[PDB]
Amino acid sequence: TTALVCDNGSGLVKAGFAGDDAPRAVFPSIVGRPRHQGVMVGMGQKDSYVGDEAQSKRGILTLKYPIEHGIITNWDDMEKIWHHTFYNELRVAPEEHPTLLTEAPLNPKANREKMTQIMFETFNVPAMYVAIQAVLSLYASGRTTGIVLDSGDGVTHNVPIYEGYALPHAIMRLDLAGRDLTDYLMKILTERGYSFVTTAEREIVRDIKEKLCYVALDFENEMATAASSSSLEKSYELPDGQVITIGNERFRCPETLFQPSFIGMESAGIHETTYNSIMKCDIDIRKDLYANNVLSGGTTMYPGIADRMQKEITALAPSTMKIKIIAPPERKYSVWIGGSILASLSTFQQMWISKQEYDEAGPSIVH
Amino acid sequence: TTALVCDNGSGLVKAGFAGDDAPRAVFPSIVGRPRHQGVMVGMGQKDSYVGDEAQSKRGILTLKYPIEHGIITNWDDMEKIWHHTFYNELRVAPEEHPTLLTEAPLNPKANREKMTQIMFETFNVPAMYVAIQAVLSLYASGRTTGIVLDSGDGVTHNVPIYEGYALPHAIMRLDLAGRDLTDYLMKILTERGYSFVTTAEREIVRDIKEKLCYVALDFENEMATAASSSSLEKSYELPDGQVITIGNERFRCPETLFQPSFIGMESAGIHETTYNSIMKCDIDIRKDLYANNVLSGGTTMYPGIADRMQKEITALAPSTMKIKIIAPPERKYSVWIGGSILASLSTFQQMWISKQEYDEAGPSIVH
Amino acid sequence: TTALVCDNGSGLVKAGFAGDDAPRAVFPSIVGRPRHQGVMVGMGQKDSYVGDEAQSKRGILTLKYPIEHGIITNWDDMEKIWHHTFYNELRVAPEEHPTLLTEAPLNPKANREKMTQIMFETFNVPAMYVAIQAVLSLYASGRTTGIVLDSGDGVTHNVPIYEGYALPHAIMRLDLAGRDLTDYLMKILTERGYSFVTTAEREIVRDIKEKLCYVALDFENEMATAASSSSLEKSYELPDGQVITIGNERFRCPETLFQPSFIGMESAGIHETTYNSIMKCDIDIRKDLYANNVLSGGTTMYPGIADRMQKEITALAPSTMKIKIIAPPERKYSVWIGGSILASLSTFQQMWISKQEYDEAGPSIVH
Amino acid sequence: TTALVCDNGSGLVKAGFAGDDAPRAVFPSIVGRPRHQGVMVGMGQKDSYVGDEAQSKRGILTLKYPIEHGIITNWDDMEKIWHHTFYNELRVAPEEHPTLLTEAPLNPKANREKMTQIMFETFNVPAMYVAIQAVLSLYASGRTTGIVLDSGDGVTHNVPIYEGYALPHAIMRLDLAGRDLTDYLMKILTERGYSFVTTAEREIVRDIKEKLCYVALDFENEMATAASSSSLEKSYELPDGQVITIGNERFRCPETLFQPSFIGMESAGIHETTYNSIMKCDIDIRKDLYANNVLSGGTTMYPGIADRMQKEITALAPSTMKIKIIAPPERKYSVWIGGSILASLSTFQQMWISKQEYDEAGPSIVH
Amino acid sequence: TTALVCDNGSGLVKAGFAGDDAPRAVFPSIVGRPRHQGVMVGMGQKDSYVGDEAQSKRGILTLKYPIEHGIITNWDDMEKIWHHTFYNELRVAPEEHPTLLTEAPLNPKANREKMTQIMFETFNVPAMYVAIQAVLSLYASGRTTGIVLDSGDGVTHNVPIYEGYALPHAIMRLDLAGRDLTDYLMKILTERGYSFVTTAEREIVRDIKEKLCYVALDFENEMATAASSSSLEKSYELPDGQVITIGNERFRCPETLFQPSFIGMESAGIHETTYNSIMKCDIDIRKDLYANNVLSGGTTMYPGIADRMQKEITALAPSTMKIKIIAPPERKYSVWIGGSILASLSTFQQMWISKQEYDEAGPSIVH
Numbered sequence A, B, C, D, E: 001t002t003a004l005v006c007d008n009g010s011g012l013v014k015a016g017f018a019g020d021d022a023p024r025a026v027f028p029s030i031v032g033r034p035r036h037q038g039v040m041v042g043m044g045q046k047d048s049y050v051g052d053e054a055q056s057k058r059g060i061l062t063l064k065y066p067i068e069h070g071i072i073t074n075w076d077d078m079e080k081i082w083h084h085t086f087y088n089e090l091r092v093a094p095e096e097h098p099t100l101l102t103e104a105p106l107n108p109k110a111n112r113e114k115m116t117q118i119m120f121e122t123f124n125v126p127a128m129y130v131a132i133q134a135v136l137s138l139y140a141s142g143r144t145t146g147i148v149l150d151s152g153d154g155v156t157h158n159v160p161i162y163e164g165y166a167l168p169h170a171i172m173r174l175d176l177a178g179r180d181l182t183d184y185l186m187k188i189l190t191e192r193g194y195s196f197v198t199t200a201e202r203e204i205v206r207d208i209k210e211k212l213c214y215v216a217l218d219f220e221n222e223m224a225t226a227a228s229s230s231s232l233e234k235s236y237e238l239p240d241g242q243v244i245t246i247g248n249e250r251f252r253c254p255e256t257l258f259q260p261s262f263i264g265m266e267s268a269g270i271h272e273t274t275y276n277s278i279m280k281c282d283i284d285i286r287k288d289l290y291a292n293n294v295l296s297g298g299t300t301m302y303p304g305i306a307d308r309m310q311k312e313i314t315a316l317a318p319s320t321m322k323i324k325i326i327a328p329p330e331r332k333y334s335v336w337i338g339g340s341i342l343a344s345l346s347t348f349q350q351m352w353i354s355k356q357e358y359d360e361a362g363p364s365i366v367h
């Protein structure tokens, strides 16, 4: 019987069988629709394109993320990505497998209740479960205690966890993520003269971000590099063949995580949110949380994140105590690994919500 | 066969085999229950935590003393601590050993009668005994005559004892103790800005009390120290990493024993209770009691107690006569030592209440 | 001109005009002082509270009996009660009236000599007299011969009196009384779990004593009632709203009068003191004393006293002769009635000590 | 000469002349600072905005409460609000008027001593006084006896008061208040999809709380209303023009006062704190306190508070006795009314601390 | 001394003295170069033609806009237009006057830094300033708050402005403008048979656009007019003498602003950009922005723009709130009027960048 683990974050769907080391199908959550009405006979006609296929044909298509800041914006688009994910990648009837789904904490009740309704009614699933991302990441680490910072494309979380358990009143979500940083890198990029207006080009600048951008230890040093131009300016090649040269924009893109005042948000940077999250927790456990702070997600991948963290949190907190930050490689797939490992635990099998227990007990029993 | 000596006071259980120099198992009488409902699979689940284990995880748990001012408040919690004490620390079937238990004087009949009922029915014990604390302390001193002041966490006693015998009409109990002094140090502590609201934090301030607080010879000198801040302010470190600095609060916490008007009680300080206890005794024996006044318990541990005693009692009593105060080191375990030594005496073995003599004669035969 | 009769016993002042059937002002001899220093503007400020007024506000005030076992402990407190008694209740300048005061027999010379000094110097009195309580009670009975047992709050007396006259060598005082019995009912009460530590609460347990407690004919029957719980347990309501249930404590409180070994006194019970008092008297008169034994005071009010007396004295004395005990209702005010009737006798008017005869003859002429 | 009464609580400053029925100037204690650096010439420039003015321009400004849980967090911000309060609203030189200031009980000594230092040195005041809030509320009621529950934005108190006087050992403070309830209504609000992240939006949700939220008699009935959606969902309009519909969130916001476990605090609800406060008081006075329990402050304004109180306290306390709760309309201004009435009393004029008596006697004489 | 205000947008240079009601010199930013090499002696020879002069001789000359979408494409052409603007129209040595220059927001840093370098080095200017267009338009309106839509020939902006200040993260630029609409009217025009291939003819079709084209309230009504040909077809005369008749092309040219899908751009129309700009602003201020939305520039001149705006924005936004659109006549010169009024303000004179402060501080100090 096994199980399917489906990590539905904005920007990437990671899906695959439980008990395995990595997800098999990893593709973007995009639903491409042709921008220009096309006059051929034979072509497509392909009214809708989905996932990596939409990535193949960006210059025709208007790309549309169905999921924004963790919240599902357009339901039938979502449904398309799931249907494509199941039959065209994993090759599987959902009626043969319980399915573990993922979601951000502190997220509107509509996402659980509609999600579950889709999975039972539209696909037919013998049982399923929807879990909090950060707990899955924490299982992937191999640890029971720690404060998780999960930064994906839609959303960034802090979830403190002590000896199992959890602290819901210290959970802190923040909308800063790969999508905000890509748009911020758009408008900062345009100051060199490089104009990326369209959805398709957004995905190009996502690529630039993913390769080139790094997090400076001290911002001022980056400013000095911008002042004298040596290793900081790097050449990147577009798909067209043009050459972009980016200097300070390389490192002032991800500086937004520490200084959200660059986007015009009053929310304190990710270091003050993690420290703030530690503050709201009981005086006893803070030492462990400081020692054990875990990183997950695509927007933790920027070289130089962990070191700046271990500067900034060490400047906020009392010096007397050790702040080890644990950011393991293969952290982008931490949530999916944790969904896998959780599905392979036998003590979890009682917790699946059954197709039957759903029809009789309602939508109210997902929580 | 030997025997088990179990010293059940509020705050600490001291237990071990008779005929030995110290108790082996010494842990707090706390029953931790998780405050926040924890979402993991595998964790615990550990609906109840007990003793030192509850101390390990204070920031999750709501700590609950099962015993308050010597009186047993919650019976099944007590039972848990005993069951944990026997099988998880002393490693012993109670059916192999007579068991000597302890209790404060002047204490409601419900504690003897329910206690004994638990020990015979729930654990099965071949015989047991429940003794008055101060008499046990007096055996530990190696002496037959003296007036015992036993200050534990729940309660403070004076028991005058002359040439063996006892004087029940001069026995005086007083609810001032480590628990009242910890709460008083809470609210006085909050005047520096340090806010300790929770049960877990109470145990932190118990730790502060145990290390830092001392009893001033004269209160006025302490006030002068508070006025010019030199040795009186000491730094203490929390488990978090924060630094607390406490000046006059160091010595005005235990001043409450001499001035219970700080808690709003009309009861005269411990020096006027000991002197008052001496007054109610026959004119013949007072000289011995004054010479031989013994100290026991955790709340006698504050540096500077004995000297202030030997000031204050010397100011109450007629000057013509010697007031020696005997406070031996290792006095916190005086009651347990006295239970040990008593269990090793052969002339005491007739006085055990037998499982058989209990079933036939009733609950009324504990007294 | 008339006269003032002032019955100053510990616990209650009974005062009023002579020639009248009862005292008008009857209130407790207490001097209330605020325990907690009060921050308002307007309140009181009322540094001292006295009498029934102090009874109105017990939970603020520390109550202090100025008179202990008949002996005056604190003089300026006494003075306060008298000054309040005169101007705030009887509404009278003491310079208009001779004043008859009361005192226990066998009582230190300081009480007569200081009392008289206060009445002449501080209040100004044209003449006064201080009388032995039991003689006043005997006048109240309407009889010339008898042995009086007067049990008040401070003290219990036996005074044998034959055909007028008196026998000073058979007068026997004993410190057992409402105050000792209230404290004894405190510590016996605490065995149900009911903890009354404070002066204010003492007055609550005085109330319990006054309503509920009775004197058992045979103690053993009371023990049997304690064994099977039927009419012996009665509900009493505190001022708070809590419910106290008291079983054997109802009747073993006043059993202390017959068995002072409950307080740890060697003094023989009130029945052996009355019998002993009869023994020290001349062989001729004993028959009358046995026939005519009179009761007075608040601590004679317990239902069942007279019958137990007429058991116990009948078991001590030779059976051949009638022991009638005379305990009239309205016996609590026997001493005050006797002071009234004595002040109305014309043959007594020569015996007043004049303000003038005092200044010239000294303090030595009170005796 | 008159006097100024200044009620400085977190969230609202109530100030005005003494002897008057209401405060004239009532505005929020906020210090607005522009978030985005503004490029105009002429604008403002207005580096700091204060009070109602900051409320006019929330979308530009970062709002900052200078006072948190009664404790002053940022001193120069405070100073700004006072300076604005005096010259821009009351129109008055402080050198013409003694000034009565307010503060929460049990509050760090730094607030009195720095406050007083500011008022004498920075403004110059001929004399001033700093009073405990609950006593002022109690004067406003027109009563001398009662237990005050004062819930403002920073903090909630219970202060029992008997016949004037006070009981400091029964005073109980609790950090639950309009500020905690607003943040709790934030995160519960976000489950409908309504995302309020910023300080400015916090003040919008404060407005929602103030209009719509009520306290349920029984929580379960509220749950039933949430289950079938009829009168419980109400429409509220934002300043933008969007429509928010809130159902169960209306009444489960203020349920936090009775169940602080919703915020993750172990502190017992406001009903168990008031009952607990009654318990620590002397047995004599509890009946009055139960009869006379007074309410004050903005966080007592929720419709349905008094009735739930008179359910819950009646379930804790012994049924035999009347629990009247007195919550007068115009209770939000109870503290300020009480400061007024106190300043108009002539017997209070001796208690002002003089500018002179301050310079000579120190900062230590505020207490 | 006064000042020069130079509004350099693509298509028209508006220049003149500050403190005046309109610009004196208004001519096209074109640099004409002869297409055919001309064989005469005496003619010209006039290797370069500039401005209105180039307009006089279009059929010989290749017209070349030096500035494209706000970005300066060819620097020495620009320089020519400035040099012609100064000496041949305004008649002025730039060394006598500070000069205020204009530029679009979000525009590459090269334009500020090179512009300033030209003005100081090539012309010599005692001081200058480069301002954001929309702020200048907002000063021209006489208002401090509003969201400006500035549509010129190169570029269209939305800049929201609140109470002075600004919101850089909500500023949105869009390349749709008179130049794109003229080319779109070219290719749509060619469907009647009218072939305009050349740069010179582009300026003819710009003229057609400026006179004849209007913005339809509803596009469908325009389609109906196209269907039955009555008032919608209008005759226009070319400079040659030929007659063009244009029906639906009159109104479907400017429909491109609302539907950029006509040019093949995915960018949402000007109504969704203005609404989107309102969305990114803080919830507090949106109402003002909706009330106060301002129009500026040549591509706002089409009759019927404001009404379609006040349809379309009213269909996007919540109906409950008033959307007034302010489009004043003489709005084409709004930016220049605002530059004038700003130069006449004395509080702005500190903000001029001095020739001296430039040489010492660098090119980096323009920002």
Ligand SMILES: Nc1ncnc2c1ncn2[C@@H]1O[C@H](COP(=O)(O)OP(=O)(O)O)[C@@H](O)[C@H]1O
Pocket (backbone or CB within 6 Å): A007, A008, A009, A010, A011, A012, A013, A151, A152, A153, A154, A155, A177, A178, A179, A182, A206, A209, A210, A211, A296, A297, A298, A299, A300, A301, A302, A303, A332
């Ligand atoms: N190597 C990288 N360097 C920096 N940013 C990255 C990198 N890889 C991806 N990202 C960013 O992180 C996002 C993917 O993170 P992911 O954890 O997969 O999000 P989610 O799980 O919510 O889909 C992308 O949208 C991208 O912007």
Ligand SMILES: Nc1ncnc2c1ncn2[C@@H]1O[C@H](COP(=O)(O)OP(=O)(O)O)[C@@H](O)[C@H]1O
Pocket (backbone or CB within 6 Å): B007, B008, B009, B010, B011, B012, B013, B151, B152, B153, B154, B155, B177, B178, B179, B182, B206, B209, B210, B211, B296, B297, B298, B299, B300, B301, B302, B303, B332
């Ligand atoms: N070193 C110390 N200094 C002062 N107080 C102490 C110290 N050790 C413990 N105590 C206090 O005394 C208590 C323990 O006394 P103990 O005699 O063990 O009580 P019990 O026998 O009733 O458990 C603690 O609760 C603590 O508050």
Ligand SMILES: Nc1ncnc2c1ncn2[C@@H]1O[C@H](COP(=O)(O)OP(=O)(O)O)[C@@H](O)[C@H]1O
Pocket (backbone or CB within 6 Å): C007, C008, C009, C010, C011, C012, C013, C151, C152, C153, C154, C155, C177, C178, C179, C182, C206, C209, C210, C211, C296, C297, C298, C299, C300, C301, C302, C303, C332
């Ligand atoms: N009805 C009663 N039942 C039993 N005890 C009583 C009763 N009335 C009062 N007493 C006790 O007797 C005392 C009062 O006796 P009283 O003769 O007035 O003493 P005195 O004359 O010395 O003041 C009280 O203190 C109380 O304890």
Ligand SMILES: Nc1ncnc2c1ncn2[C@@H]1O[C@H](COP(=O)(O)OP(=O)(O)O)[C@@H](O)[C@H]1O
Pocket (backbone or CB within 6 Å): D007, D008, D009, D010, D011, D012, D013, D151, D152, D153, D154, D155, D177, D178, D179, D182, D206, D209, D210, D211, D296, D297, D298, D299, D300, D301, D302, D303, D332
């Ligand atoms: N009508 C109301 N309904 C419920 N809550 C209110 C209402 N009015 C104000 N409050 C809450 O109470 C607070 C104001 O109380 P207040 O007594 O003025 O506090 P303080 O005196 O400490 O400033 C506000 O912060 C708000 O959250």
Ligand SMILES: Nc1ncnc2c1ncn2[C@@H]1O[C@H](COP(=O)(O)OP(=O)(O)O)[C@@H](O)[C@H]1O
Pocket (backbone or CB within 6 Å): E007, E008, E009, E010, E011, E012, E013, E151, E152, E153, E154, E155, E177, E178, E179, E182, E206, E209, E210, E211, E296, E297, E298, E299, E300, E301, E302, E303, E332
């Ligand atoms: N009366 C009009 N009707 C419609 N379009 C016009 C009209 N006047 C000029 N325009 C268009 O607007 C442009 C000029 O706008 P302007 O604000 O002067 O741009 P900029 O300030 O960027 O030079 C021209 O290129 C033309 O296409």
Ligand SMILES: [Mg+2]
Pocket (backbone or CB within 6 Å): A009, A133, A150, A151, A152, A153, A297, A298, A335
């Ligand atoms: Mg993720």
Ligand SMILES: [Mg+2]
Pocket (backbone or CB within 6 Å): B009, B133, B150, B151, B152, B153, B297, B298, B335
């Ligand atoms: Mg002990």
Ligand SMILES: [Mg+2]
Pocket (backbone or CB within 6 Å): C009, C133, C150, C151, C152, C153, C297, C298, C335
């Ligand atoms: Mg008497």
Ligand SMILES: [Mg+2]
Pocket (backbone or CB within 6 Å): D009, D133, D150, D151, D152, D153, D297, D298, D335
């Ligand atoms: Mg208040």
Ligand SMILES: [Mg+2]
Pocket (backbone or CB within 6 Å): E009, E133, E150, E151, E152, E153, E297, E298, E335
């Ligand atoms: Mg323009």
